[PDB]
Design a protein around this ligand. Structure first.
Ligand SMILES: C[C@H]1Sc2ccc(C(=O)NO)cc2NC1=O
Ligand SMILES: [K+]
Ligand SMILES: [K+]
Ligand SMILES: [Zn+2]
Length: 393
């Protein structure tokens, strides 16, 4: 079965932020308009028996002091009065400012993704689903005691932690977002059981700054986690095929050597040619150019390993819905072996007018550095195998 995280309270909470507005409502409504919902298993978000149980779940990664500050920030934003100088200073010490400000539902919004990604991990653990999708999750930048790049709570780290601790176990994390997945990489830096891999753009002054050369060398983990953090920085302007050729062999070689028990894929839509970032030139095209996202999702799904698929970045809301709707249909096709015919025209639904003026499912777009990175990565995987006493071909 293929699971998808949703609910009425979950939808209201996922649509309550000022940065992502109603994006989640558009993604789920396009999936529903295309009659994909009957083919999917509804995975309800996790709920706790008490504030103590919730705090124990979140503090498996975040500090109590940061969680307290985030809850206080919500309370302060449900009042018209300005924050005191002392409260501004407290929030600044946790970076609860600038790109991560307060708003009336900041804590409920952030916790909602945690609730969804933990429930998604649980459904894989009990074998109820073979793959689970969470389009409200994928907040890769959040750190132990720091909000970062629109991420307040790291739902990915908490989901992976639940997976790695499930047997009385190895997880492969694949980060497809345009930005380097620093928060997840940092959390498992000292752990060989979680292997992280991020493909992204990296250039001077481009967020977050990491996932590139530090004689410059790549840092890749420490202690028992040495060689367990993998990075592929790419130049701006990369199309579907070149991005596909750069990642394909790395993905296949990580599966062969690591042999993960679970795969967690962060599927941020900010690499799309139509994203306001305008860095990469990836599409959502599915031939009967092939979308970079659709090529990598298909490859990962062909391994037959229980997989968690998450959202993330994606600033052109209708185009993010166009891609994630196609990811959802491909996942059904690949897991169930049931053809999902999707009409090239947008079906009529509540958000139809947002897909104008053409109303098409395809995004409206017309189209040896990698070799040295490939040789560096092949050597890192060999050192990872040598240190971890794994048998490789
Ligand atoms: C304001 C800057 S910083 C920034 C941080 C995170 C993201 C993101 O989507 N990460 O997954 C985007 C950003 N873009 C900016 O212009
Ligand atoms: K990435
Ligand atoms: K690691
Ligand atoms: Zn991003």
């Amino acid at each position: 079965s293929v699971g998808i995280v949703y609910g009425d309270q979950y939808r209201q909470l996922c649509c309550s932020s000022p940065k992502f507005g109603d994006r989640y409502a558009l993604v789920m409504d396009l999936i529903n308009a295309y009659k994909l919902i009957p083919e999917l298993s509804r995975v309800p978000p996790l709920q706790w028996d008490s504030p103590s149980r919730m705090y124990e779940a979140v503090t498996a990664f975040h500090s109590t002091e940061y969680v307290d500050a985030l809850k206080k920030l919500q309370m302060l934003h449900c009042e018209e009065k300005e924050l005191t100088a002392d409260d501004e200073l407290l929030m600044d010490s946790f970076s609860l400012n600038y790109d991560c400000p307060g708003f009336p539902s900041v804590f409920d919004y952030s916790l909602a993704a945690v609730q969804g990604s933990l429930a998604a991990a649980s459904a894989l653990i009990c074998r109820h689903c073979e793959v689970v999708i969470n389009w409200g999750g994928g907040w890769h930048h959040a750190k132990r005691s720091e909000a970062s790049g629109f991420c307040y709570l790291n739902d990915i780290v908490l989901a992976i932690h639940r997976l790695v601790s499930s047997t009385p176990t190895r997880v492969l994390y694949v980060d497809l977002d345009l930005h380097h997945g620093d928060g997840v990489e940092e959390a498992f830096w000292y752990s060989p059981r979680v292997v992280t891999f991020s493909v992204h753009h990296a250039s001077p002054g481009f967020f977050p700054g990491t996932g590139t050369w530090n004689l410059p060398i790549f840092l890749n983990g420490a202690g028992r986690g040495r060689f367990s953090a993998f990075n592929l920085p790419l130049e701006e302007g990369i199309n579907d095929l070149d991005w596909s050729n750069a990642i394909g062999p790395i993905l296949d070689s990580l599966n062969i050597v690591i042999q993960p028990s679970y795969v967690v894929v962060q599927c941020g839509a900010d690499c799309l040619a139509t994203d306001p970032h305008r860095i990469f030139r990836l599409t959502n095209f599915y031939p009967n150019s092939l979308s970079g996202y659709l090529y990598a999702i298909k490859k990962i799904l062909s391994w037959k390993v229980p997989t968690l698929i998450l959202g993330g970045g994606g600033y052109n809301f209708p185009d993010t819905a166009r891609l994630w709707t196609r990811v959802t249909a491909l996942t059904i096709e690949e897991v169930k072996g049931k053809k999902m015919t999707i009409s090239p025209e947008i079906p009529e639904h509540s958000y139809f007018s947002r897909y104008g003026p053409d109303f098409e499912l395809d995004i409206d777009y017309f189209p040896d550095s990698i070799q040295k990175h490939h040789r560096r990565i092949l050597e890192q995987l060999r050192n990872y195998a040598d240190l971890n006493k794994l048998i490789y071909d």
